Amino acid sequence: DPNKRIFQAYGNAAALFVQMGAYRGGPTTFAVVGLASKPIHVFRLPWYKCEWISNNGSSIRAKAYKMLPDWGYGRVYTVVVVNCTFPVNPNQDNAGGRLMLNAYYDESQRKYEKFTALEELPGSYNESKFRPPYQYEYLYCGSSLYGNLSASRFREWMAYHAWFFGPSSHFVFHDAGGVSPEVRAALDPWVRAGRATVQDIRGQAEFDGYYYNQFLVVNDCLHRYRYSANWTFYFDVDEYIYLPEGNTLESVLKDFSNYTQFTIEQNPMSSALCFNDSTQDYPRQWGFEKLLFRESRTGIRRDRKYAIQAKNAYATGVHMSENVIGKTLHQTETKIRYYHYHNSIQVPGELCREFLPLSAKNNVTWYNGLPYVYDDNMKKLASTIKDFERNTIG
Amino acid sequence: PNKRIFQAYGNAAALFVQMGAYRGGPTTFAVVGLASKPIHVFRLPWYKCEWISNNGSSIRAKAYKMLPDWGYGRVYTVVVVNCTFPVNPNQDNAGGRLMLNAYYDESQRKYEKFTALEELPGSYNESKFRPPYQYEYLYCGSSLYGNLSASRFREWMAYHAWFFGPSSHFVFHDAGGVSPEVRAALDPWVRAGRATVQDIRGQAEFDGYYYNQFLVVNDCLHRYRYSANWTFYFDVDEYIYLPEGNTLESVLKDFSNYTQFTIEQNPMSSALCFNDSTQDYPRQWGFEKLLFRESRTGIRRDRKYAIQAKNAYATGVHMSENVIGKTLHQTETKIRYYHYHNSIQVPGELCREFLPLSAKNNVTWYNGLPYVYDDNMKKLASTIKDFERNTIG
Ligand SMILES: *[C@@H]1O[C@H](CO)[C@@H](O[C@@H]2O[C@H](CO)[C@@H](O[C@@H]3O[C@H](CO[C@H]4O[C@H](CO)[C@@H](O)[C@H](O)[C@@H]4O)[C@@H](O)[C@H](O[C@H]4O[C@H](CO)[C@@H](O)[C@H](O)[C@@H]4O[C@H]4O[C@H](CO)[C@@H](O)[C@H](O)[C@@H]4O[C@H]4O[C@H](CO)[C@@H](O)[C@H](O)[C@@H]4O)[C@@H]3O)[C@H](O)[C@H]2NC(C)=O)[C@H](O)[C@H]1NC(C)=O
Ligand SMILES: *[C@@H]1O[C@H](CO)[C@@H](O[C@@H]2O[C@H](CO)[C@@H](O[C@@H]3O[C@H](CO[C@H]4O[C@H](CO)[C@@H](O)[C@H](O)[C@@H]4O)[C@@H](O)[C@H](O[C@H]4O[C@H](CO)[C@@H](O)[C@H](O)[C@@H]4O[C@H]4O[C@H](CO)[C@@H](O)[C@H](O)[C@@H]4O[C@H]4O[C@H](CO)[C@@H](O)[C@H](O)[C@@H]4O)[C@@H]3O)[C@H](O)[C@H]2NC(C)=O)[C@H](O)[C@H]1NC(C)=O
Ligand SMILES: *[C@@H]1O[C@H](CO)[C@@H](O[C@@H]2O[C@H](CO)[C@@H](O)[C@H](O)[C@H]2NC(C)=O)[C@H](O)[C@H]1NC(C)=O
Ligand SMILES: *[C@@H]1O[C@H](CO)[C@@H](O[C@@H]2O[C@H](CO)[C@@H](O)[C@H](O)[C@H]2NC(C)=O)[C@H](O)[C@H]1NC(C)=O
Ligand SMILES: *[C@@H]1O[C@H](CO)[C@@H](O)[C@H](O)[C@H]1NC(C)=O
Ligand SMILES: *[C@@H]1O[C@H](CO)[C@@H](O)[C@H](O)[C@H]1NC(C)=O
Ligand SMILES: *[C@@H]1O[C@H](CO)[C@@H](O)[C@H](O)[C@H]1NC(C)=O
Ligand SMILES: *[C@@H]1O[C@H](CO)[C@@H](O)[C@H](O)[C@H]1NC(C)=O
Ligand SMILES: *[C@@H]1O[C@H](CO)[C@@H](O)[C@H](O)[C@H]1NC(C)=O
Numbered sequence: 166d167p168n169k170r171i172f173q174a175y176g177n178a179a180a181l182f183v184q185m186g187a188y189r190g191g192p193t194t195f196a197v198v199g200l201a202s203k204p205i206h207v208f209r210l211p212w213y214k215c216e217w218i219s220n221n222g223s224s225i226r227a228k229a230y231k232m233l234p235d236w237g238y239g240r241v242y243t244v245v246v247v248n249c250t251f252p253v254n255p256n257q258d259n260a261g262g263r264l265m266l267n268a269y270y271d272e273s274q275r276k277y278e279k280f281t282a283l284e285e286l287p288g289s290y291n292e293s294k295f296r297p298p299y300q301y302e303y304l305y306c307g308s309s310l311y312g313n314l315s316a317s318r319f320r321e322w323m324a325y326h327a328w329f330f331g332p333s334s335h336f337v338f339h340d341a342g343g344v345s346p347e348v349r350a351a352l353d354p355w356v357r358a359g360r361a362t363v364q365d366i367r368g369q370a371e372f373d374g375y376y377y378n379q380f381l382v383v384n385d386c387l388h389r390y391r392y393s394a395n396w397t398f399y400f401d402v403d404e405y406i407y408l409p410e411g412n413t414l415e416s417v418l419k420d421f422s423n424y425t426q427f428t429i430e431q432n433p434m435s436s437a438l439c440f441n442d443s444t445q446d447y448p449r450q451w452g453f454e455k456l457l458f459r460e461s462r463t464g465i466r467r468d469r470k471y472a473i474q475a476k477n478a479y480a481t482g483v484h485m486s487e488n489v490i491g492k493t494l495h496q497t498e499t500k501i502r503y504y505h506y507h508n509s510i511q512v513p514g515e516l517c518r519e520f521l522p523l524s525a526k527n528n529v530t531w532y533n534g535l536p537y538v539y540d541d542n543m544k545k546l547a548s549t550i551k552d553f554e555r556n557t558i559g
Numbered sequence: 560p561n562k563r564i565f566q567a568y569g570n571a572a573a574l575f576v577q578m579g580a581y582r583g584g585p586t587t588f589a590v591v592g593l594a595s596k597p598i599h600v601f602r603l604p605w606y607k608c609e610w611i612s613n614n615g616s617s618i619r620a621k622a623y624k625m626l627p628d629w630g631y632g633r634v635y636t637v638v639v640v641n642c643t644f645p646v647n648p649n650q651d652n653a654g655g656r657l658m659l660n661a662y663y664d665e666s667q668r669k670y671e672k673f674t675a676l677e678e679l680p681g682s683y684n685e686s687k688f689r690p691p692y693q694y695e696y697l698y699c700g701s702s703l704y705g706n707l708s709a710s711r712f713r714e715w716m717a718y719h720a721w722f723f724g725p726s727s728h729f730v731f732h733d734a735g736g737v738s739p740e741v742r743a744a745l746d747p748w749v750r751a752g753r754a755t756v757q758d759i760r761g762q763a764e765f766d767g768y769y770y771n772q773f774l775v776v777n778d779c780l781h782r783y784r785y786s787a788n789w790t791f792y793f794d795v796d797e798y799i800y801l802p803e804g805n806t807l808e809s810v811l812k813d814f815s816n817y818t819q820f821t822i823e824q825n826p827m828s829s830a831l832c833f834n835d836s837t838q839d840y841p842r843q844w845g846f847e848k849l850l851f852r853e854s855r856t857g858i859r860r861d862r863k864y865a866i867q868a869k870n871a872y873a874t875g876v877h878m879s880e881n882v883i884g885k886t887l888h889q890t891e892t893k894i895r896y897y898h899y900h901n902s903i904q905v906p907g908e909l910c911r912e913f914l915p916l917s918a919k920n921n922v923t924w925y926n927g928l929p930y931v932y933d934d935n936m937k938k939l940a941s942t943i944k945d946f947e948r949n950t951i952g
């Protein structure tokens with residue numbers, strides 16, 4: 166009795182699997198996006214198995230594999246995309262069923278977790294969703310927004326990009342606390358117009374600090390709207406897509422047709438450098454109308470953003486996808502870029518804070534040990550965007 | 560609708576896995592178990608200790624931890640939680656239980672609180688932390704697993720019951736290795752009150768997720784902290800040997816002013832024996848048989864140790880790094896141990912590579928290593944066999 170030793174475990178320092186979303190990505194294939202506890206030492210094979218349980222008890226086994234697109238180190242959890250693919254539509258009949266997932270600890274699979282990842286009710290399967298035409302031409306997948314964010318910037322970003330991507334475009338935001346009541350009011354005209362979706366992901370709080378927030382959202386957004394549009398764009402609300410003179414959005418995407426994804430080089434802008442000029446009413450100018458100074462360094466590599474055809478994507482990361490079918494284009498510099506106003510969206514008050522002489526229009530200005538040049542490309546569109554906003558939401 | 564849900568499933572790593580909670584003195588306790596390490600989150604304190612007495616009151620204790628194993632490569636790390644009070648929280652002997660809080664990190668507010676141990680009213684007996692103690696020496700064995708040979712256990716128990724004398728006890732930890740054959744070999748010693756075979760077969764739930772040997776040494780350390788003057792740590796394929804001119808009492812007297820000392824190794828072949836028909840190897844014991852010692856010089860070799868548990872807080876598998884007092888390694892002339900590597904899990908006759916009688920005086924190269932003749936243990940076989948028949952029959 167006393168020599169019958171017992172090992173009493175307490176607490177749960179890491180779940181095996183945390184599901185954020187589960188989506189059908191075609192007549193034949195599904196994706197489960199979430200978090201996983203990585204194995205240590207013990208060999209884990211398989212990580213998962215997928216089954217479809219039709220509503221009359223019959224089960225069809227699926228070919229399952231996973232992708233771990235985040236850094237892989239430094240956090241309790243790693244973002245995981247579980248790809249379940251069947252030989253035929255397991256719900257071809259449309260009688261309904263359930264995609265079930267098995268999650269394993271080690272190859273000595275005594276213990277495992279089985280759960281329903283999603284249910285399709287009888288008659289709800291709809292093959293016309295994976296056939297053209299799709300809901301939108303373009304879809305913006307937003308980052309996870311947290312902190313003290315400026316409503317005025319959201320107002321200006323939405324107006325600019327609602328114009329940039331045209332009427333057949335939708336915008337998906339992920340609210341992790343950053344969407345203030347004031348930011349929400351800025352998005353409200355577009356929400357009410359059916360153009361913007363604001364997802365509440367404030368329930369992620371109990372996991373904050375235990376995984377990489379941006380890698381989860383990009384992959385969930387990738388599969389939640391996999392067939393909603395033809396091109397999914399990934400960038401932040403302090404970043405503005407721009408087409409150099411002599412290009413349309415349809416022109417550039419047509420030149421990029423035969424590529425599954427393409428990257429977009431950055432035009433880094435100062436969020437503080439403005440002209441010393443009592444002529445200008447900076448409190449009444451928009452961000453990209455005021456911040457006209459671009460860091461001028463040549464031949465230095467900077468962070469990039471990207472657009473992707475989710476049809477041919479299985480997972481993705483923050484700056485591009487590593488899990489696609491098809492080619493990847495990077496030579497995009499002459500035809501599409503994005504202006505980046507770093508550390509602008511969290512700034513209260515006037516963004517204009519370091520004021521330069523009018524001499525700086527034609528000379529190189531040194532600020533924070535970096536060279537800058539005048540660039541008014543975006544300021545030239547401020548008038549066009551403001552009319553568009555008035556003509557679209559009043 | 561758009562209110563996203565995060566559905567968690569499973570438990571891939573508990574926060575704390577207790578194996579044993581122990582009173583280490585009038586003022587202090589220890590909780591030995593496993594812990595999940597924090598990953599990029601600040602965890603401080605890891606634990607808090609509280610004594611809820613049957614009197615009603617509740618006194619907090621100073622709590623600190625020790626992580627004596629490698630600290631990486633496994634889901635869990637072995638932990639010894641040390642709870643010390645300014646006064647015996649049960650001087651009243653009114654009873655009470657030692658509560659232990661375990662925390663995930665500073666960010667999260669809730670934690671895990673459980674009963675590490677409970678002391679019924681009138682069970683505390685201070686005289687158990689003062690001499691005389693139950694035994695003079697105690698042996699703390701390893702986690703026993705695999706297909707183990709019962710004949711080796713019998714030879715080992717017979718030798719070390721003689722080596723350590725009558726006031727000695729032997730603690731074995733059965734994690735699967737104590738077959739019915741092995742158990743029968745130990746049964747004469749168990750029935751005589753000289754050996755304890757703990758059942759730690761419940762360890763299989765966590766097999767592969769922590770360092771087996773590090774957990775057992777630390778639970779044995781505190782489980783029998785004041786049971787003996789000295790606690791010896793080594794395996795059943797290892798035999799403590801005293802170069803002639805030294806007795807156990809003699810050596811331990813020279814070492815008294817040291818809290819622990821390490822013991823160098825004499826590596827033996829578990830396969831090499833003489834090509835000699837006058838030898839009846841099926842009727843010879845292991846150390847009576849395997850007479851060839853690996854002879855390389857200046858080579859870093861594993862060591863074993865003995866420790867005065869009363870002044871130890873945690874330990875490892877080759878020595879402790881959490882003690883008060885000196886540590887001694889210059890022991891090479893006075894005490895050693897013969898190590899018969901990969902012998903215990905071998906079925907059948909150990910003698911398997913047979914050498915000419917010439918090998919008594921030359922170096923023998925086997926598997927690329929040099930070996931020499933060494934009959935120091937064989938000389939004692941008759942003594943051990945006489946002691947066995949005169950002790951267990
Ligand atoms: C889980 O993982 C599994 C894999 O482990 C995923 O399943 C894979 O998904 C892939 C993407 O959906 C899929 O690849 C696509 O298959 C389509 C169907 O092809 C069928 O026919 C061919 C024979 O012709 C068969 O061999 C094949 O097996 C199928 O039966 C193809 O149509 C797709 O091809 C297009 O993209 C590739 C990528 O480079 C091109 O090479 C190809 O030429 C096609 O390119 C056209 O379309 C792209 C845009 O998609 C344009 O950029 C390009 O310029 C072409 O555009 C013209 O043509 C289209 C019409 O096709 C037209 O609309 C357009 O306007 C232009 O005129 C592609 O090959 C894999 O087969 C599939 N694998 C398996 C085993 O199932 C699963 O999705 C994952 N699940 C989740 C949830 O992530
Ligand atoms: C949790 O953690 C806490 C703290 O982190 C742990 O608490 C600490 O535990 C220590 C070890 O148990 C303890 O230290 C010991 O205290 C003993 C009692 O001290 C009382 O007596 C001394 C006088 O002897 C007073 O000064 C003191 O104020 C107390 O009243 C001491 O007896 C121990 O001293 C001996 O060991 C040290 C370390 O080597 C020597 O330096 C010292 O000289 C003593 O050495 C003699 O004994 C050892 C064997 O014990 C011999 O090796 C040595 O050669 C000497 O032997 C002669 O003398 C002894 C007399 O005992 C005689 O029997 C023998 O035959 C020889 O003639 C030691 O110092 C800390 O005080 C204590 N701290 C606190 C804050 O509580 C707690 O244990 C942890 N919990 C668990 C479960 O692990
Ligand atoms: C997404 O792209 C597809 C493929 O380019 C579009 O479908 C094609 O549209 C053109 C022009 O209307 C037709 O000539 C082709 O026959 C269509 N192809 C197929 C396979 O149907 C589709 O219109 C785009 N989706 C949206 C919402 O604009
Ligand atoms: C544990 O060690 C102590 C310290 O040497 C032993 O107690 C001493 O024994 C001698 C000889 O009998 C006495 O003269 C001393 O007075 C004892 N010391 C104390 C503090 O009482 C003790 O015998 C050892 N334990 C066992 C079981 O042998
Ligand atoms: C939001 O504001 C508070 C105080 O104004 C600040 O402590 C907090 O850090 C801000 N959020 C972020 C993400 O910086
Ligand atoms: C279109 O993309 C495919 C990759 O799926 C590639 O093999 C093919 O060469 C591309 N077509 C052209 C004209 O480059
Ligand atoms: C609990 O025991 C302690 C120690 O004797 C004492 O100080 C305290 O008064 C006791 N509590 C009660 C409620 O009597
Ligand atoms: C115990 O024996 C069985 C077969 O006899 C074997 O499969 C197993 O591996 C053995 N144990 C070890 C530790 O080798
Ligand atoms: C052992 O002894 C026998 C009998 O002398 C001999 O035939 C044999 O070659 C010796 N060596 C080995 C390896 O068996």
Ligand SMILES: *[C@@H]1O[C@H](CO)[C@@H](O)[C@H](O)[C@H]1NC(C)=O
Pocket residue numbers: 816817883884885
């Ligand atoms: C006895 O041990 C103490 C440490 O507890 C040490 O300071 C002292 O030097 C030792 N005695 C001798 C003679 O080395």
